[PDB]
Design an enzyme around this catalytic site. Structure first.
Site, PDB file in Angstrom:
ATOM      1  CG  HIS A 158     -17.359 -61.659  25.510  1.00 44.63           C
ATOM      2  ND1 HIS A 158     -17.161 -61.109  24.255  1.00 44.63           N
ATOM      3  CD2 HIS A 158     -18.048 -60.757  26.293  1.00 44.63           C
ATOM      4  CE1 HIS A 158     -17.864 -59.968  24.225  1.00 44.63           C
ATOM      5  NE2 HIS A 158     -18.364 -59.712  25.425  1.00 44.63           N
ATOM      6  CE  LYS A 162     -21.344 -62.721  24.784  1.00 48.51           C
ATOM      7  NZ  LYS A 162     -22.230 -63.187  23.716  1.00 48.51           N
TER       8      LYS A 162
END
Ligand SMILES: NC(=O)C1=CN([C@@H]2O[C@H](COP(=O)(O)OP(=O)(O)OC[C@H]3O[C@@H](n4cnc5c(N)ncnc54)[C@H](OP(=O)(O)O)[C@@H]3O)[C@@H](O)[C@H]2O)C=CC1
Ligand SMILES: NC(=O)C1=CN([C@@H]2O[C@H](COP(=O)(O)OP(=O)(O)OC[C@H]3O[C@@H](n4cnc5c(N)ncnc54)[C@H](OP(=O)(O)O)[C@@H]3O)[C@@H](O)[C@H]2O)C=CC1
Ligand SMILES: NC(=O)C1=CN([C@@H]2O[C@H](COP(=O)(O)OP(=O)(O)OC[C@H]3O[C@@H](n4cnc5c(N)ncnc54)[C@H](OP(=O)(O)O)[C@@H]3O)[C@@H](O)[C@H]2O)C=CC1
Ligand SMILES: NC(=O)C1=CN([C@@H]2O[C@H](COP(=O)(O)OP(=O)(O)OC[C@H]3O[C@@H](n4cnc5c(N)ncnc54)[C@H](OP(=O)(O)O)[C@@H]3O)[C@@H](O)[C@H]2O)C=CC1
Lengths: 272, 272, 272, 272
Positions: A158, A162
């Site tokens: 990600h 994140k």
């Protein structure tokens, strides 16, 4: 699209509202009923479905449910719980089926949705991606046949912003696998590998986490034996994945009036 | 092969000895000089280079350096330091150039190698893979142009019996990158991601570790920006990667008599 | 292993014979019954299961079925059809269940296997990999839910000596997908993309083929939509994948005496 | 950003214009000078850099070069050649350095750019991605050390609407490799693999093409030997990759007034 089922998209100029438009526009059998916005709204009254591109679509950005309450069949909401509960009571009222993607309800909130559902057909889910869901379901089919031999690892990547590791989708994966094996994730997950750490313990499920740039979301579960590995990977490129699934559900609602359903329901994952 | 340069492979029935054979056999310009084994040796006297397949090769498994000391040009050793230091003094003696892959020397051990090198041409390295080395060198070229913007992540996968995390090759990668950026790995590595952990800190180099099945070794360094990522990955399938590089070095020795060299030397990585 | 079910491996010094050994050795509940070789055999009479490593295993390389016909429960054959049909008639004779991986029978050949099966329990398959098979079965589950929206692509990589493109496993993948969609591969496959070729035609299944180095075998099927992709990939590292599945079948035979089964049967793929 | 160098972005409401904004906004040392639009322009006079998000930025969408000709240092153009040649003559006039990404000039067109450059500093390139370019340069470094042994394959994936196979970036890759090896792509490329086709011919460069969904662009070059593979892959997620490189060049122009440069120049690829 123009097609047997008619759709209103609240949150019209929002991050998903935009996408939900192109989707609605795109999917055969669903036609863009109405497009709401919020009073203060500058896209109001007109700017008619041209966030999704497609120049002009006929439908026009409004502000009133009753100003349009007959332009649409299913109501699509990705807003805020405070809007949700608004939309809710009007949907119930006019027997309007809903598709809710909004997150963050409290408990009072879910009960309401749940109660509304006695009189109205609602699709409410925390993840509208079809890929993810299908994937979660293949994960347990693979776990039943291989889960026992293999070393099962879960790798997710990600963007740099994140803030939790691993993601919820990853944990969800871990959980499907674990339950397929009548195990508990809690007793076999391994979230970090640093330093000297003996050979991998059998039966474990390790997690590897990648955080970089703008990665929307990538998930891979690996079933590794001696001699081979099976991988099932899900890559999200845009938030169009959520939009698409919302619309599909909208089309599936068509012909329901029952209760509370989820993507499992829409996707008939139970008989797959 | 039969070709201008002649090669003896000690450790003939060993894990690498086998591979070093097929390699020697395979590489143009190198021809299988001799194949040694250890006294007790059952492959002794005959079983002539048919570990590598290729039925018969002409050369025969021996036990004595002087029993063959004129069948070969370069001596290839992947043994044990105790054998190494044997082979060493005989190589020095007869001006035989060496290729040493053996690991685990102590300090006394390295000095010897280092001293032998005053009179003899030796290639001694801890990693004979050409891919790895080339890779380590491209990593710093990429780091110089992108190192600054990007989020650099390193992902490695190894079999279930690897006992340290991350691997040394991974750490080596981290280190090349870090030094390219005049940084210190120590102040920016991140080896685990578990739980709540804020947004990724700029300038960091995170490590993700996968341990499963029989994976020989996979390494990926990622240079991730908004909008794109560059990946440089190395996958090892067999220990043939080490063998190949040893033989190439053997061919490169041909014509040297100087000092102490490494894969950098063989590979001219310095002028790449 | 030593365990409730007992196994003989014909072809003992062959490419698979070796692996089938370590497998048998490894898998719980199966114990290495006997190890045959071919008369001329140099590994004869003794060299007792030490191709698989494990020094000594108790069992000894023989040459006669009746010399051992009571050391084993299930007969494992990866040989040549001419040996197969030998082994066959003796297995039938002594109610010995078989596991056949040998390929290349003619029609006369299959009928025999098929007939033998009236009296004996046989597992005969063209691909003993569990990963592949599981994979072929997940492919149709994914095809049923996504097959319709998505762009389905199949990418395979093999060593430099593979002479047909695409592989049979790839074609098999194409075929499972196609049949899941009540389509025919023949009317939608696309094997090459060169030059000017308009936008991709919907409903097509394209094939991409990679031929390089020593790649044992890699297969990926991709289910690509706007916004996401699901990939299911199978990577074979060694021929241990075939061996493992043969042994598992051997263990599954235990308790059958019926007909003709395949990996589907062993793997209960039909109720997955 | 606000920083030593000042930037105008023509094409302000265009596909790149949007991105070029956020970039300019983002990159340290570059500050958003002006934002042009086309007369008919509805984003005119005001809608001041809030396509890139960031609410308000101070700068305002205009229509006249001379209406702003002193708000900016470097002119950034991703428009149409007809606009380009406009912008061109005004840039030359006021010694304004340019960054041109526009494509499709004819020959008359390039000469102009080329001539303008006698008096003005221009960056003109067909690919502004830094990743791609860096990548093309690492490809020849890898080709020089491995090109000879290895099987070099190029795999590219693009959306379902890409009409040529392989892409130009892929061909470009092929070409860098080929030239590194003093070869000609024309005599060794292989664009399709269908049917029975013998073992892979040494020295060849094969191409594998994937066309599916919304894939922005993925390129991988593989250097495969026996025992290992090196891969260098470039994944484009958005057209932000082009924008970023344009802006970087804009910052690099700062302090030039010379000729005609390219990304090689900006990126000092020649001394890498
Ligand atoms: N379930 C799933 O698969 C996923 C869910 N989401 C969820 O969907 C929702 C939408 O996300 P996103 O589009 O990013 O959010 P945004 O910030 O983009 O926008 C929310 C939208 O709702 C409108 N709105 C906000 N509050 C209310 C309200 N009280 N009444 C009416 N309209 C309201 C906003 O209008 P304005 O700003 O102008 O007032 C805007 O149009 C979130 O809850 C998100 O978590 C997102 C992706 C996936
Ligand atoms: N530098 C690199 O790129 C790499 C290095 N290696 C290193 O190379 C060496 C070889 O590894 P590997 O093949 O796995 O090891 P093995 O256990 O496979 O075998 C070692 C070999 O050396 C022989 N031998 C051992 N001790 C001596 C001795 N004192 N004198 C003479 N011969 C000796 C053994 O014969 P016997 O058992 O019959 O006595 C055997 O043939 C190790 O040091 C390993 O760490 C491996 C891969 C890579
Ligand atoms: N079904 C599947 O999943 C797969 C099947 N295979 C198949 O299994 C078989 C084995 O492959 P592989 O191990 O590579 O082949 P090999 O060449 O390695 O060896 C074949 C083995 O069978 C022995 N043999 C050969 N002919 C006969 C015979 N007439 N009677 C008795 N023994 C015989 C050979 O002994 P000797 O040379 O000394 O006579 C050798 O031991 C092949 O048919 C192959 O296609 C392989 C992988 C997968
Ligand atoms: N070099 C590279 O790395 C890459 C280059 N590009 C190139 O950059 C250009 C921009 O692409 P893109 O943003 O997609 O294109 P768009 O269609 O998105 O927009 C072009 C923009 O230029 C404006 N414009 C068009 N014609 C003229 C003109 N004659 N005079 C002034 N302004 C003009 C348009 O305004 P309006 O419509 O309102 O008139 C619009 O703002 C193209 O040439 C493209 O090929 C794109 C990516 C990469």
């Amino acid at each position: 699209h123009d097609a047997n089922i008619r759709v209103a998209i609240a949150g019209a100029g929002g991050r998903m509202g935009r996408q939900l438009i192109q989707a609605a526009l795109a999917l055969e059998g669903v036609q863009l009923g109405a497009a709401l916005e919020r009073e203060g709204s500058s896209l109001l009254g007109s700017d008619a479905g041209e966030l999704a591109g497609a120049g002009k679509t006929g439908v026009t950005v409004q502000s009133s449910l009753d100003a349009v309450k007959d332009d649409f069949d299913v109501f699509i909401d990705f807003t805020r719980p405070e809007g949700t509960l608004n939309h809710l009571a009007f949907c119930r009222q006019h027997g309007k089926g809903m598709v809710i993607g909004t997150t963050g309800f409290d408990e009072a909130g879910k009960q309401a949705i749940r109660d509304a559902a006695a009189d109205i057909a609602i699709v409410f889910a925390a993840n509208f991606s079809v890929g993810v869901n299908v994937m979660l379901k293949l994960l347990e089919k693979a776990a039943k046949v291989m889960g026992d031999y293999t070393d099962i690892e879960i790798i997710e990547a990600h963007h740099r912003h994140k803030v939790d590791a691993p993601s919820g989708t990853a944990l969800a994966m871990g959980e499907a696998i674990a339950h397929a094996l009548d195990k508990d994730l809690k007793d076999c997950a391994v979230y970090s590998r640093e330093g000297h750490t003996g050979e991998r313990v059998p039966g474990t499920i390790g997690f590897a986490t990648v955080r970089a740039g703008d990665i929307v979301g990538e998930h891979t579960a690996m079933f590794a034996d001696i001699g081979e590995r099976l991988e099932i990977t899900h890559k999200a490129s845009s938030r169009m994945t959520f939009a698409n699934g919302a619309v599909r559900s909208a089309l599936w609602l068509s012909g329901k009036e029952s209760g509370l359903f989820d993507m499992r329901d829409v996707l008939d994952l139970n008989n797959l």
